């Protein structure tokens, strides 16, 4: 029933245009993307095990023309494989086009295109920061609820070539074994405390040694020694996360043992930050493509 090729073509038809121009998909089509992608998310593991080559991207936040930019730098699927780390919606002006193209590509290339859950893929958050308002203005509240049901089934973390641990936010004090992530039940809303919360909300902090309070008013901050012990315990080389705006698009922490990625240049139209995209090759070498703000 769902014509994915037609949907992707219309979404990509606005390429090269001045940012702002919408793509008007039909309600039944956007609902179709949610229901079908949801099935795929539930069919695949909640802790993804992926293999290079792979392109990894951080926060997008409805900056649709910067998503299109990332693909023209990285290569449009299926030329390259992709892992996104969450926060697809809110703040930007085109959350709908952004999430729709991502879900379209997931349905089209389910073994070569991956999406993790960010803290904004939660009804309680995206009701406040723009996505609910965008859905209401352009379609209806029922469609927004259909996105919620989809988001509640997104995977939570990925391990790339048994060496890179990927999640939106960061580590948890309750994360002792990877089996604990695998035992998280979907669908679920993101709780105010616990493992799932921390994985989507925590931040690294240079001034903290162990675990400390997070200025967000939720989850914790973690220091470089916590990163060191986590990598050694689970025999990993790198934590790759997002969740925080960084000026150069990427930023290393704890002597290159953790990296923060952010893929929305000129975030909110307020910051003057670059976006970045991490490339991982077959030899497990990491490199970065940089998108300066325009
Ligand atoms: Mn974000
Ligand atoms: Mn976030």
Numbering used by the authors: 6 to 299
Direct quotes from the study:
PP1 relies on a dinuclear metal center (rather than cysteine) for catalysis (Egloff et al, 1995; Goldberg et al, 1995) and is considered to be regulated largely through binding to specific targeting and inhibitor proteins, with little known about its physiologic redox regulation (Heijman et al, 2013). The PP1 catalytic domain displays a compact ellipsoidal structure with its dinuclear metal center situated at the base of a shallow groove on the molecular surface (Egloff et al, 1995; Goldberg et al, 1995). Recombinant PP1 is typically expressed in the presence of manganese salts, thus leading to a mostly Mn‐Mn center, but a previous report suggested a mixed Mn‐Fe center (Egloff et al, 1995). Our metal analysis on PP1 crystals detected both Mn and Fe ions (Mn:Fe ratio ~1:0.175), with anomalous difference electron density maps revealing the presence of Mn at both coordination sites.
However, a one‐electron reductant, ascorbate, efficiently reversed PP1 inactivation. H2O2 treatment causes an overall shrinkage of the PP1 coordination sphere by 0.12 Å compared to ascorbate‐treated crystals consistent with the oxidation of the dinuclear center. A transition from Mn(II) to Mn(III) or from Fe(II) to Fe(III) upon H2O2‐dependent metal oxidation would shrink the ionic radius of the metal by up to 0.14 Å (Cotton et al, 1999), thereby shortening the bond distances between the metal and coordinating residues and increasing the energy barrier for phosphate hydrolysis. In our crystallographic studies, two cysteine residues, C127 and C273, were often observed oxidized to a sulfenic derivative in electron density maps. Cys oxidation appears independently of H2O2 treatment as we have observed sulfenic acid derivatization also in ascorbate‐treated crystals. C127 and C273 are peripheral to the metal center and unlikely to affect enzyme activity, and we found that a PP1 C127/273S double variant exhibited the same catalytic activity as wild‐type PP1 and responded identically to H2O2 treatment.
